[PDB]
Write a protein that binds this ligand. Structure first.
Ligand code: NDP
Ligand code: NDP
Ligand code: EA0
Ligand code: EA0
Lengths: 532, 526
């Protein structure tokens, strides 16, 4: 129709508005307040805004001239169209919008009332005529709310370039509720931090409810696994949403895409119990903790439990009773009479988990007795040592913390899943590799990502550094077969911008953290899923 | 010129022919007693089908509008090439068959199978035909003539990394004339390694803009991140497709030269460092022994046999002239380690001790430790054989209790093993990686190790996976690595273990053969 010929796109930025909370895309709808934007500066958004609304491709115009000239029977700049309130919100120093053909919709104002190089129009109709008579690359509709509403209603927008600002502000004007039959998300950017907020960038698309070295590629693929003998042929129709997306650049796709590779290419193995998994061997995920806290959004996660577990580690505790009194059941099943007995630990008290994480972190090499013993200045205090190496020998390549004490494996309730952490220091920034031997992608890994990201924050802080990358190496990476249905639901959910973690900044010692020193801000998440 | 207008490509496979310098000319064996030198290499024969038959009609109009202004492919043989084909397929599964000959007239074959008089009489035949591209199938004389008359554009060169008896040879491709632009993955077919290379003759997109927008933040407007120049990675940056597994190593060198953090180390030499890489090599298809420089494996095999024995006695190696642990056992080094009461070349409770006796009290390097501490090596073998789905098959050398007693903490933290469908894969996590000197030896060490465990458990080796923690290039290695990045790998050699060996403790140095190691010349990394 008219939207494809004239390439009329919309670009906006929406925050959450003043309102056990449910989240949909309508969560991000706040456009402005008291004639201006709800927020002071979000520079990264503003820079995106300029890059998109001023970018042209010289060479591509020729074919757009042809297309548009054909329909009418007949430096390069983009057009930008804005309501009069929007235009008035711009500071003088930036009027008219640089390196762009500015247009303004208005009834109360005519050319005579503007000093500046701008086209005025009183009709949506008048714009289409204007574009007909103009050389431009792309036409972007800048808002505000009234301009957005009518260009949508009139089926005129090809794509909505949409910034999710993952914070809340007082708002008096809102973006229109986008009909999900009309527009579908096809792209989601990396998540980022700017002016103390996370944000990403998503592109909604409308529906209708030297080519010599391109042949060389087809050749170097003469030996590929065809569509039929691709191990577990699970049905396309199931992952419709996941496969529709053109760009999957949200860091959560790092987890999601491993679920997919295991489902589509995983080896079928019956395991330790006689259950059933799909397994592969050797993955890596990287998460930029300076830009976001990678708590998964495609389902709900609570961190109270796993933060209690991490504080329990740092204290050197092996006593399951301490966590159960905090109503944290993460270790309950590994602590039962039935379980300790089946691990041949007949002479071990219930909930006495033996020389596990905590004990190995503060006392590696000390003889484990029972969970009540005072092990002070017994065994190597690994945690203290790596905090000292990071502080005094930051370039050291021996800042490992290790839980896999070979000597004590059979005395633990079960060997550590999370084998070791290596630390790395450059330019006052701390990164952390964690090697995981056995990873339940379905229940375990979401939490495992959350635990070591929080741990990197804690170490970084008490060493006067800034968290950089948390790097997660998976050994045996497996999906339980009864999790498959639940994971299908999950792969078809589109990630939201990650939240942020705040550490009480008065904590200067690794031991001095307590629950209330941990605040997750702006967790926007899909609905709880039982993997069972 | 003719060869770009008409699209004349050669397509050859060359094996090796009966110390030794290597270069591309190494590969030239074309045929023997009128047939191919080798019995059957079905992957190359499959590659041959695909490349010659493939057609893309949506790029033929662009060809049609250039060709005139001057659907199948044209395939050009020579009698003895046309002849040597077994009967039951002629013509070749739907291609425009064509034969250069002198004493063969176009009468006594069909009405599709166009014969030609001379080389100059083919340009005639093409201008009057409807074909995608033109493939010279060889053999010796055909290639010679078609190359001599600068008719060939690209060359689809299959490198057969095994030696055979040959009576005919591809010509020495002039490397100021032609040059390699693509190299494929390395493969095993019919008990040889091979790869596929390409010589070129020298000189909705709504979604394509969406790509550019998503890149709006990048720290690359061209500001020289590290003092490493463009024109120096010329050959490296002048390749389109770099799918040879050795590029996994080479691309880490590149990433760390381009984007690495400038750092002091203990020695003070200066490094570029990054943090967290994976490499995967397919042990079922090759032995990943770097080809872009000479590597020797006797020492590192003795090192491994020393580990398996449980030894911590640096002298057992020194008497075999394996000097890998010489520096780490000197009086001066042990003293800087605060190991004042440790005998020279007593390396303390390192790899071998930990693998065989983890948890045992280390005394000196001559004590008897029989049946003390945990014999992890024994334990992961039983687990592999008796519980292969176990996710607990780790061999860990990093013993926190004993670190300070070791000449140095293990560079190689742990091996984790994985078993599926009678196949064994291994991950080695390396806390600290010297990419220039160390890592190439480290890849070879644990690949061999992966084979040894595989064999004694009656499994086929699959993947060796190398996780690098602190990945550093020494500032004083950068010249050498610049020379190295602009070399093009050869197809990898293979490891043959003496099959009689069935327990991990029974391998001697004799039980290890490296085969078809075709390599560039030695580099002093200094
Ligand atoms: N490895 C590879 O990539 C390939 C190589 N081969 C091997 O190559 C070997 C053959 O090598 P080679 O002896 O050179 O055979 P060729 O394939 O070069 O065949 C030579 C024949 O082609 C004709 N011919 C040669 N020169 C001309 C010319 N200038 N104009 C017209 N016709 C010409 C015949 O003339 P005349 O009529 O007088 O006989 C001549 O006998 C075999 O062992 C074969 O298996 C096989 C296929 C490809
Ligand atoms: N967060 C974001 O992405 C963006 C934020 N905003 C914010 O939105 C607010 C402004 O939006 P809003 O108040 O809805 O107003 P608009 O910016 O949409 O301005 C509407 C006005 O434009 C004129 N107009 C609009 N449509 C027509 C038409 N079809 N024909 C003629 N004149 C027309 C009229 O001007 P007149 O009164 O002269 O008749 C009308 O009152 C501000 O707070 C601004 O900062 C705006 C853009 C982007
Ligand atoms: C900049 C902003 C809020 N972000 C996106 N993604 N898309 C928009 N429409 N934005 O508003 C731009 C606009 O129309 N107004 C505006 C306000 C101030 C200045 Cl300096 C420039 C433009
Ligand atoms: C098969 C071979 C050696 N490999 C490549 N890459 N390309 C060639 N030119 N090859 O030779 C094929 C050919 O021309 N002759 C031939 C020989 C046997 C049979 Cl079955 C079919 C064709």
């Amino acid at each position: 129709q008219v939207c494809d010929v004239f390439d009329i796109y919309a670009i906006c930025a929406c925050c959450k508005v003043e309102s056990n909370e449910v989240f949909n895309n309508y969560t991000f709808r706040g456009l402005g307040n008291k004639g201006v934007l709800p927020w002071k500066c979000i520079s990264l958004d503003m820079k995106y805004f300029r890059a998109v609304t001023t970018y042209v491709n010289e060479s591509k115009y020729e074919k757009l001239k042809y297309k548009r000239c054909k329909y009418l029977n007949k430096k390069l700049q983009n057009v930008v169209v804005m309501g009069r309130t929007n235009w008035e919100s711009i500071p003088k120093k930036f009027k008219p919008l640089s390196n762009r053909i500015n247009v303004i919709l208005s009834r109360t104002l005519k050319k005579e009332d503007f000093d500046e190089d701008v086209y005025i129009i009183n009709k949506v109709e008048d714009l289409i005529v204007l574009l007909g008579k103009l050389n431009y690359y792309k036409c972007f509709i800048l808002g505000g709310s009234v301009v957005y509403q009518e260009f949508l209603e009139k089926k005129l927008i090809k794509k909505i370039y949409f910034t999710r600002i993952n914070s809340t502000y007082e708002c008096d004007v809102f973006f229109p509720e986008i009909n999900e039959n009309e527009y579908q998300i096809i792209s989601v950017s990396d998540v980022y931090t700017s002016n103390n907020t996370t944000l990403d960038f998503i592109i909604y698309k409308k529906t209708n409810n030297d080519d010599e070295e391109e042949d060389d590629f087809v050749y170097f693929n003469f030996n590929k696994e065809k569509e039929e003998k691709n191990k577990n042929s699970i049905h396309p129709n199931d992952f419709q949403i996941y496969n529709s997306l053109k760009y999957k650049y949200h860091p959560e796709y790092q987890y999601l895409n491993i679920i997919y590779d295991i489902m589509m290419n995983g080896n079928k193995q019956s395991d330790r119990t006689g259950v059933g998994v799909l397994s592969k061997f050797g993955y890596i995920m990287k998460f930029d903790l300076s830009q976001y806290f990678p708590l998964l959004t495609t389902k709900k996660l609570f961190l109270r439990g796993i933060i209690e577990e991490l504080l329990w580690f740092i204290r050197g505790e092996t006593n399951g009773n301490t966590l159960l009194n905090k109503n944290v059941r993460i270790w309950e099943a590994n602590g039962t009479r039935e379980f300790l007995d089946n691990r041949k630990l007949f002479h071990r008290e219930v909930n006495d988990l033996g020389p596990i994480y905590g004990f190995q972190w503060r006392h590696f090499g000390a003889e484990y007795t029972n969970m009540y013993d005072n092990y002070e200045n017994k065994g190597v205090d690994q945690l203290k040592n790596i905090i000292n190496l990071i502080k005094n020998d930051p370039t050291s390549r021996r800042i490992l913390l290790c839980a896999w004490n070979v000597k004590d494996l059979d005395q633990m309730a079960l060997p550590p899943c999370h084998i070791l952490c290596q630390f790395y220091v450059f330019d006052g920034k701390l990164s952390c590799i964690m090697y995981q031997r056995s990873c339940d992608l379905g229940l375990g890994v979401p939490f495992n990502i959350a635990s070591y990201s929080i741990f990197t924050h804690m170490i970084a802080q008490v060493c006067n550094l800034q968290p950089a990358q948390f790097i997660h190496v998976l050994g045996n990476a497996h999906v339980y077969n009864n999790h498959i249905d639940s994971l299908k639901i999950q792969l078809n959910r589109i990630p939201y911008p990650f939240p942020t973690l705040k550490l009480n900044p008065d904590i200067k010692n690794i031991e001095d953290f307590t629950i209330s020193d941990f605040t997750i801000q702006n967790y926007v998440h899909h609905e709880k899923i039982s993997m069972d």
